Scaffold this active site. Sequence first.
Site, PDB file in Angstrom:
ATOM      1  N   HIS A   1       9.535 -16.355 103.188  1.00 53.22           N
ATOM      2  CA  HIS A   1       9.279 -17.549 102.401  1.00 53.22           C
ATOM      3  C   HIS A   1       8.965 -18.721 103.317  1.00 53.22           C
ATOM      4  CE1 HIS A   1      10.291 -15.543  98.749  1.00 53.22           C
ATOM      5  NE2 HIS A   1      11.544 -15.330  99.099  1.00 53.22           N
TER       6      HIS A   1
HETATM    7  C1  LIG Z   1      10.427 -13.500  95.625  1.00 53.00           C
HETATM    8  C2  LIG Z   1      10.803 -12.087  95.958  1.00 53.00           C
HETATM    9  O1  LIG Z   1      10.379 -11.481  96.902  1.00 53.00           O
HETATM   10  S1  LIG Z   1      11.953 -11.391  94.807  1.00 53.00           S
HETATM   11  C3  LIG Z   1      11.417 -12.168  93.254  1.00 53.00           C
HETATM   12  C4  LIG Z   1      10.754 -11.128  92.372  1.00 53.00           C
HETATM   13  N1  LIG Z   1      11.522 -10.859  91.165  1.00 53.00           N
HETATM   14  C5  LIG Z   1      11.369  -9.745  90.456  1.00 53.00           C
HETATM   15  O2  LIG Z   1      10.575  -8.867  90.766  1.00 53.00           O
HETATM   16  C6  LIG Z   1      12.232  -9.608  89.243  1.00 53.00           C
HETATM   17  C7  LIG Z   1      12.009  -8.284  88.543  1.00 53.00           C
HETATM   18  N2  LIG Z   1      11.329  -8.453  87.270  1.00 53.00           N
HETATM   19  C8  LIG Z   1      10.734  -7.445  86.643  1.00 53.00           C
HETATM   20  O3  LIG Z   1      10.699  -6.311  87.107  1.00 53.00           O
HETATM   21  C9  LIG Z   1      10.046  -7.752  85.319  1.00 53.00           C
HETATM   22  O4  LIG Z   1       9.442  -9.033  85.366  1.00 53.00           O
HETATM   23  C10 LIG Z   1      10.942  -7.594  84.060  1.00 53.00           C
HETATM   24  C11 LIG Z   1      12.030  -6.549  84.320  1.00 53.00           C
HETATM   25  C12 LIG Z   1      11.598  -8.936  83.723  1.00 53.00           C
HETATM   26  C13 LIG Z   1      10.112  -7.148  82.862  1.00 53.00           C
HETATM   27  O5  LIG Z   1       8.760  -7.600  83.028  1.00 53.00           O
HETATM   28  P1  LIG Z   1       7.904  -6.955  81.893  1.00 53.00           P
HETATM   29  O6  LIG Z   1       6.475  -6.997  82.250  1.00 53.00           O
HETATM   30  O7  LIG Z   1       8.271  -7.626  80.581  1.00 53.00           O
HETATM   31  O8  LIG Z   1       8.456  -5.463  81.844  1.00 53.00           O
HETATM   32  P2  LIG Z   1       8.706  -4.351  80.744  1.00 53.00           P
HETATM   33  O9  LIG Z   1       8.102  -3.060  81.123  1.00 53.00           O
HETATM   34  O10 LIG Z   1      10.209  -4.297  80.500  1.00 53.00           O
HETATM   35  O11 LIG Z   1       8.025  -4.933  79.448  1.00 53.00           O
HETATM   36  C14 LIG Z   1       8.734  -4.980  78.194  1.00 53.00           C
HETATM   37  C15 LIG Z   1       7.786  -4.678  77.062  1.00 53.00           C
HETATM   38  O12 LIG Z   1       6.421  -4.822  77.511  1.00 53.00           O
HETATM   39  C16 LIG Z   1       5.691  -3.664  77.172  1.00 53.00           C
HETATM   40  N3  LIG Z   1       4.646  -3.475  78.170  1.00 53.00           N
HETATM   41  C17 LIG Z   1       4.800  -3.482  79.529  1.00 53.00           C
HETATM   42  N4  LIG Z   1       3.691  -3.286  80.194  1.00 53.00           N
HETATM   43  C18 LIG Z   1       2.736  -3.142  79.201  1.00 53.00           C
HETATM   44  C19 LIG Z   1       1.349  -2.910  79.246  1.00 53.00           C
HETATM   45  N5  LIG Z   1       0.654  -2.775  80.379  1.00 53.00           N
HETATM   46  N6  LIG Z   1       0.690  -2.817  78.071  1.00 53.00           N
HETATM   47  C20 LIG Z   1       1.380  -2.949  76.936  1.00 53.00           C
HETATM   48  N7  LIG Z   1       2.685  -3.168  76.772  1.00 53.00           N
HETATM   49  C21 LIG Z   1       3.310  -3.257  77.949  1.00 53.00           C
HETATM   50  C22 LIG Z   1       6.713  -2.532  77.110  1.00 53.00           C
HETATM   51  O13 LIG Z   1       6.265  -1.483  76.259  1.00 53.00           O
HETATM   52  C23 LIG Z   1       7.891  -3.268  76.479  1.00 53.00           C
HETATM   53  O14 LIG Z   1       7.696  -3.328  75.051  1.00 53.00           O
HETATM   54  P3  LIG Z   1       8.736  -2.695  74.064  1.00 53.00           P
HETATM   55  O15 LIG Z   1      10.094  -2.916  74.628  1.00 53.00           O
HETATM   56  O16 LIG Z   1       8.538  -3.361  72.714  1.00 53.00           O
HETATM   57  O17 LIG Z   1       8.383  -1.222  73.916  1.00 53.00           O
END
Ligand SMILES: CC(=O)SCCNC(=O)CCNC(=O)[C@H](O)C(C)(C)COP(=O)(O)OP(=O)(O)OC[C@H]1O[C@@H](n2cnc3c(N)ncnc32)[C@H](O)[C@@H]1OP(=O)(O)O
Lengths: 527, 527
Positions: free
Chosen positions: B168
């Site tokens: 960072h």
């Molecule tokens: C700075 C650094 O180095 S560390 C900081 C980084 N932080 C992180 O990486 C934190 C981790 N966060 C994450 O992994 C994600 O952002 C999460 C866990 C919050 C979820 O992100 P999301 O994109 O919402 O993931 P998720 O797969 O759970 O999506 C939930 C819904 O979206 C849907 N969905 C996801 N991808 C798709 C897609 N491509 N097309 C259609 N629907 C989709 C899923 O079906 C689900 O729907 P449902 O529950 O009704 O069936």
Amino acid sequence: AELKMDQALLLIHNELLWTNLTVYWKSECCYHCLFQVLVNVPQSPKAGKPSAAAASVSTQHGSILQLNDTLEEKEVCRLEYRFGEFGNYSLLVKNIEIACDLAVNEDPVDSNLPVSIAFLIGLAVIIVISFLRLLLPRLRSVDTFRGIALILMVFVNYGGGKYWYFKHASWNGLTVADLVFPWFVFIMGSSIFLSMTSILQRGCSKFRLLGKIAWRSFLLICIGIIIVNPNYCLGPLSWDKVRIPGVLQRLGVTYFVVAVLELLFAKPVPECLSLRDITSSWPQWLLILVLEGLWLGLTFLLPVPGCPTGYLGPGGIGDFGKYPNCTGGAAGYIDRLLLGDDHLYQHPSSAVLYHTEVAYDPEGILGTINSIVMAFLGVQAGKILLYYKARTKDILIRFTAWCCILGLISVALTKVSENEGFIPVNKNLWSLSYVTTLSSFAFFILLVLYPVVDVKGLWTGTPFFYPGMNSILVYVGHEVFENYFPFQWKLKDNQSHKEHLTQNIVATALWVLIAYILYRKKIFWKI
Amino acid sequence: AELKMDQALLLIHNELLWTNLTVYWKSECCYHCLFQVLVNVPQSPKAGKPSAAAASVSTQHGSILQLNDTLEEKEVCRLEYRFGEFGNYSLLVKNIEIACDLAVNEDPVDSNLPVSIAFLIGLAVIIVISFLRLLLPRLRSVDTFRGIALILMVFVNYGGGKYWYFKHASWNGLTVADLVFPWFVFIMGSSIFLSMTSILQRGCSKFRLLGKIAWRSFLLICIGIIIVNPNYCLGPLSWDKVRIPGVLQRLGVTYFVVAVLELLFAKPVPECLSLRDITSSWPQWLLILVLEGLWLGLTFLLPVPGCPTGYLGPGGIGDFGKYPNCTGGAAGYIDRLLLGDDHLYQHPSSAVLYHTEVAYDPEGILGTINSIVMAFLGVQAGKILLYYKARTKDILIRFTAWCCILGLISVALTKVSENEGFIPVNKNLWSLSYVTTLSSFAFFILLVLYPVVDVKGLWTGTPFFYPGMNSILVYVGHEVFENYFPFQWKLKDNQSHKEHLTQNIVATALWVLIAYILYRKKIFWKI
Ligand SMILES: CC(=O)SCCNC(=O)CCNC(=O)[C@H](O)C(C)(C)COP(=O)(O)OP(=O)(O)OC[C@H]1O[C@@H](n2cnc3c(N)ncnc32)[C@H](O)[C@@H]1OP(=O)(O)O
Ligand SMILES: CC(=O)SCCNC(=O)CCNC(=O)[C@H](O)C(C)(C)COP(=O)(O)OP(=O)(O)OC[C@H]1O[C@@H](n2cnc3c(N)ncnc32)[C@H](O)[C@@H]1OP(=O)(O)O
Ligand SMILES: *[C@@H]1O[C@H](CO)[C@@H](O[C@@H]2O[C@H](CO)[C@@H](O)[C@H](O)[C@H]2NC(C)=O)[C@H](O)[C@H]1NC(C)=O
Ligand SMILES: *[C@@H]1O[C@H](CO)[C@@H](O[C@@H]2O[C@H](CO)[C@@H](O)[C@H](O)[C@H]2NC(C)=O)[C@H](O)[C@H]1NC(C)=O
Ligand SMILES: *[C@@H]1O[C@H](CO)[C@@H](O[C@@H]2O[C@H](CO)[C@@H](O)[C@H](O)[C@H]2NC(C)=O)[C@H](O)[C@H]1NC(C)=O
Ligand SMILES: *[C@@H]1O[C@H](CO)[C@@H](O[C@@H]2O[C@H](CO)[C@@H](O)[C@H](O)[C@H]2NC(C)=O)[C@H](O)[C@H]1NC(C)=O
Ligand SMILES: CC(C)CCC[C@@H](C)[C@H]1CC[C@H]2[C@@H]3CC=C4C[C@@H](O)CC[C@]4(C)[C@H]3CC[C@]12C
Ligand SMILES: CC(C)CCC[C@@H](C)[C@H]1CC[C@H]2[C@@H]3CC=C4C[C@@H](O)CC[C@]4(C)[C@H]3CC[C@]12C
Ligand SMILES: CCCCCCCCCCCCCCCC
Ligand SMILES: CCCCCCCCCCCCCCCC
Ligand SMILES: *[C@@H]1O[C@H](CO)[C@@H](O)[C@H](O)[C@H]1NC(C)=O
Ligand SMILES: *[C@@H]1O[C@H](CO)[C@@H](O)[C@H](O)[C@H]1NC(C)=O
Ligand SMILES: CCCCCCCCCCCCCC
Ligand SMILES: CCCCCCCCCCCCCC
Ligand SMILES: CCCCCCCCCCCCCC
Ligand SMILES: CCCCCCCCCCCCCC
Ligand SMILES: CCCCCCCCCCCCCC
Ligand SMILES: CCCCCCCCCCCCCC
Ligand SMILES: CCCCCCCCCCCCCC
Ligand SMILES: CCCCCCCCCCCCCC
Ligand SMILES: CCCCCCCCCCCCCC
Ligand SMILES: CCCCCCCCCCCC
Ligand SMILES: CCCCCCCCCCCC
Ligand SMILES: CCCCCCCCCCCC
Ligand SMILES: CCCCCCCCCCCC
Ligand SMILES: CCCCCCCC
Ligand SMILES: CCCCCCCC
Ligand SMILES: CCCCCCCC
Ligand SMILES: CCCCCCCC
Ligand SMILES: CCCCCCCC
Ligand SMILES: CCCCCCCC
Ligand SMILES: CCCCCCCC
Ligand SMILES: CCCCCCCC
Ligand SMILES: CCCCCCCC
Ligand SMILES: CCCCCCCC
């Protein structure tokens, strides 16, 4: 004050004018330990002004004190007393002959009160739930048994309240902590037979079953070496500090040997005084007796350099300190010869009471023979369950017979004593009498749990079969999340038994609830 | 030698007879830092025998050295040089006027050679695989985008090779590490809209959807507080040391606000220059602009006691050290007012270059407004994808238009500079220009990835969509098993970039393989 947990304060007042004293301490739980120096009290500079010194004495077991004149190396008096936790005792040595008297300044606390209260609270909840409910394939007894052993180890591993009877015994004898691992090996043998009989009855091939056996054994060993053994809070893993033996490694090796034996000599279950379940599996019995002869021969006849042959002892200051580096005997010698000191367990349970300096691994190489014998007795229990499933009287009679035979063998070996038998019970060595004692306990448990849970249906095993159906997930899980909230938080007093016991009970209940949630969602992991 | 990683050796020989010297060091990456004392070299006791002293200077950025006479407090000479890693430089100060000359004894190493080699090896593998293959519902572009961000954070969190551009940024500007979190918020907004549209099209009730939204937000916050934040290798958790903000807490709050807004003003997707996707959702835009006005007002107008109003700076020795405890300004002040110092992040990224002593949390309370704005721009991307799914030209035109608008806003705010803009890019403050810059990058990425992966099908997203379908499992997983083998082992040299880079690349590839195994077994966890 400065007393730690399970310690009393001893104040020694020396009224003798011309003789110093040296205070030697020995625990009653030691078998033939050496006296160790406790404190040095000098002579009284003037009459009426006795010199004093304070020492901390353990209160878990009885204490033996010997006061020796540091000049003439003679004994002036000797006391055998049992000090209580956080007590404040004063010992006065005065002329007229020399007699030393022990007095109690501050009374000790009742340190087992939390355990007594936790049992009554648990018993009061059971009665309320049973009374309230009154107003309102897969064997369940085996799941209940496995879940009981699981709940016990989660309580024990998480600390056990820091009570000495919820920890592993130092060298010889039994505590509550020493019961759970043999029962897991026993149940794992029983499940080996049940699963293999079902699969081979469905017509599945023996070679694909062999592949599944090899995969499961390899996976268990790898998980044990990489995930469970290391303490990663210390630092990254280096090969020279890797501990090769362990619990899951023991299970993997035992599972492979026993499962491959049963697969090799498998027979269909045929359809009442008869020895069919025994005589139909005589090749296994021959090989098991050969292994048992091997364990006895290597334990009692292998010459260990710089050590008595057939030494069954802790070393350290035990056995009058003649063999300070002979912890284990042939078992430890084989471990060190094949793997090396730096790949063994560095904190054996004897290190606290016998002050041993060498490394000894309880899950070593030589005890795997007796681990296999325990698992094969579990296989025999499964054979009884399947051969005579039509008749409940036959099952109960056979369980009683096996329990009695193994009990009599244990009585003969141990001589109904902790240290004086021919082969005393010992978890570190995985003794023969350890195996026979715990097998008789397992057969009695199955005797009680089969008609209650399976035949009559009076009980369903709640809440024990929920972790019993997710044993591996619960085990690996509490090892991974041992230090995590809510399983552990910072205590207001680390030297309190009540706070440790409450914390460990809460964590164990949380793991039962996690397993119930997984069961409720139909998520079962089989390794 | 005793040089640590990314450090050079500077030997200073003072040939002056009657004047001591004090060596002041300033980094080029600082914006208005203060000079700090590097080493004190005394005067030469005799002519021809110059006194010497050795100092270690960082080599990540350029160095500025100022030699000041410690008596007259005047400057004798000033050097601006860029030292190389593990180099051995000698600086000679001598009369005839005073001039100081810098010489190179031992040449430095090329510290970016592992990064250049790791890119060529990766590029060589891609060409071989593509050439070899030539001889032989759920949008996939969104999964590929999420998987790319996942692979990047796993490389970054595990260390990034200890390279300064995979960490960072101290206060202002961008590195590779500062891109991944905003992209996760963007993708999470897009997925919010896709999921909600599908569910409300299947006829599901809005109140059950609201219950699912609340459950998911609560669960994310709890996992972040209890599992991800604490360092349990230090000890058991105590409340006074609990860090309340965090990454998953930010995602939970942002998800709740954005999902509830979309649910509240949800409309069916109707069936080509038109602003339908924008004007049909004007209440959201009004509320989002109100929140953005709130962020600007609280950041530029809130009076912080003992601090300039509208201070956008690191404090510490930055800004000529006038404001040593003003790290953050209004954002940090609100964090400390509501939560307290002991519930914030104790090692902010500015602590190394600006030497700040106070606690600052990058995921604080005031930046959640801009986190919500980023997620709502992601929602707009999902709206473009669903409203104009029939026409690919419409989708590409709209992605290009949004990328250009957000790029122009970022150019206006940052003035195409790191520290001289009106609102410079800053991950700690979650600046407005941080959000607009990363949103334009996300729109450009979607512009490239949509026709390639979804429309034409030229690429399938391999190997990026495998973790993109198990993002939460991969994230929580690498946080839990960060210290475990095979993700970390003991290195032969901790001060080598090559060994750290190899270790982190191997660990990242292992997480891609774990996610591929879960995908291959059809095991997908949605929080
Ligand atoms: C700075 C650094 O180095 S560390 C900081 C980084 N932080 C992180 O990486 C934190 C981790 N966060 C994450 O992994 C994600 O952002 C999460 C866990 C919050 C979820 O992100 P999301 O994109 O919402 O993931 P998720 O797969 O759970 O999506 C939930 C819904 O979206 C849907 N969905 C996801 N991808 C798709 C897609 N491509 N097309 C259609 N629907 C989709 C899923 O079906 C689900 O729907 P449902 O529950 O009704 O069936
Ligand atoms: C000393 C201390 O305090 S710590 C030391 C304690 N160590 C441990 O607790 C180690 C942990 N060990 C364990 O949890 C177990 O012993 C394990 C993981 C090795 C497995 O033991 P098992 O009883 O074999 O468990 P598991 O449920 O995996 O059984 C495997 C097979 O038995 C079958 N099975 C299990 N229980 C039953 C039952 N009651 N009836 C019928 N079949 C059963 C399963 O269906 C499965 O068969 P399948 O794979 O063909 O479908
Ligand atoms: C304390 O003094 C007693 C003497 O009464 C010691 O007991 C003797 O120890 C010698 C070894 O030095 C033995 O040979 C004797 O058999 C022991 N008994 C008697 C009656 O003499 C005792 O060892 C001393 N304690 C310690 C710790 O050395
Ligand atoms: C154990 O009890 C003795 C008394 O039997 C305590 O000794 C007293 O100590 C206090 C303060 O240290 C003095 O003011 C008294 O004069 C002492 N009394 C005697 C009779 O010596 C001793 O402190 C107690 N130890 C504890 C509580 O740890
Ligand atoms: C090194 O000496 C120089 C003198 O040339 C210092 O520069 C001056 O510092 C004073 C503050 O004490 C300012 O008022 C002047 O404007 C500065 N410039 C000049 C030309 O005098 C410099 O501050 C000294 N370095 C350190 C670290 O104190
Ligand atoms: C940096 O280079 C100088 C030479 O330019 C090294 O100084 C030499 O050090 C060795 C042993 O310390 C002496 O035997 C030589 O006489 C020194 N030479 C001179 C010209 O001073 C110095 O050790 C190097 N620093 C390192 C390698 O860390
Ligand atoms: C056939 C079954 C019952 C037993 C199998 C194990 C037997 C054959 C083996 C196992 C270990 C062996 C012992 C190992 C070492 C020694 C020490 C040597 O100075 C004499 C032989 C002696 C004492 C061996 C006797 C035979 C022995 C006991
Ligand atoms: C309506 C939209 C565009 C903006 C909403 C935020 C506005 C109404 C609020 C948010 C924070 C507020 C500021 C907070 C504190 C101060 C300091 C005080 O000495 C004068 C008022 C002043 C300067 C406020 C002006 C109004 C303000 C900027
Ligand atoms: C050895 C002491 C352990 C104390 C906890 C025992 C388990 C208590 C059960 C609580 C959770 C019940 C979940 C299932 C309810 C149907
Ligand atoms: C940012 C550097 C990370 C280096 C590793 C990138 C991922 C490599 C993929 C290896 C595993 C492939 C599994 C799926 C194969 C179909
Ligand atoms: C007791 O020990 C002291 C050491 O402080 C020593 O000087 C003294 O001589 C000893 N007592 C006797 C009787 O020797
Ligand atoms: C340089 O520093 C020394 C301290 O060791 C001091 O004695 C000396 O006076 C200083 N030089 C001058 C010119 O004052
Ligand atoms: C600490 C000494 C242990 C000795 C145990 C001996 C008894 C063995 C079993 C007796 C019968 C068990 C029936 C449940
Ligand atoms: C069909 C998959 C086979 C996997 C084989 C893995 C190695 C098995 C070794 C098990 C040895 C355990 C006892 C020593
Ligand atoms: C026809 C299907 C056969 C599947 C593999 C079975 C053989 C596995 C051999 C493993 C032996 C392990 C010895 C260490
Ligand atoms: C259905 C085919 C049966 C043929 C015999 C299968 C025996 C399998 C056990 C082999 C044991 C060897 C372990 C290395
Ligand atoms: C086919 C039947 C042949 C009978 C062989 C004799 C069986 C011996 C069984 C050994 C059991 C001893 C340990 C309990
Ligand atoms: C470190 C300074 C960052 C400033 C970035 C300004 C550029 C913003 C985006 C430009 C267009 C992006 C198209 C992919
Ligand atoms: C149907 C299940 C409802 C569960 C409710 C749990 C609490 C929700 C609070 C979420 C707040 C997050 C934003 C502040
Ligand atoms: C008829 C089914 C309704 C299911 C529950 C929906 C309501 C949940 C309310 C949660 C609100 C969270 C506010 C913090
Ligand atoms: C199918 C019934 C629709 C009625 C309106 C539902 C609105 C749900 C959003 C409520 C937002 C409040 C969050 C606390
Ligand atoms: C069968 C599994 C063996 C795993 C051994 C792990 C060795 C770790 C050492 C790596 C650091 C040098
Ligand atoms: C200070 C003690 C507070 C912790 C009490 C145990 C936790 C119980 C609830 C766990 C659910 C997450
Ligand atoms: C919403 C979840 C909050 C969890 C807070 C954990 C507090 C741990 C402190 C317990 C030790 C005193
Ligand atoms: C000393 C370095 C050895 C570790 C190499 C990385 C591990 C690769 C295999 C992991 C599969 C368990
Ligand atoms: C030792 C048994 C205690 C039972 C407590 C059950 C309530 C969680
Ligand atoms: C699974 C990889 C094992 C590597 C062992 C290396 C021993 C130094
Ligand atoms: C009927 C086959 C028995 C094979 C010998 C058993 C001991 C190896
Ligand atoms: C070798 C002395 C007697 C051992 C007891 C036998 C138990 C079956
Ligand atoms: C397959 C390795 C073990 C996975 C970790 C499980 C933690 C509950
Ligand atoms: C930085 C890209 C490296 C790619 C290595 C892939 C082989 C595991
Ligand atoms: C989930 C239990 C939280 C307990 C917090 C206690 C603060 C001292
Ligand atoms: C058509 C309803 C709009 C409600 C006002 C939007 C801003 C709160
Ligand atoms: C307040 C100075 C100008 C800000 C730039 C505006 C970008 C839309
Ligand atoms: C639901 C809490 C998180 C479970 C741990 C998962 C580790 C891979």
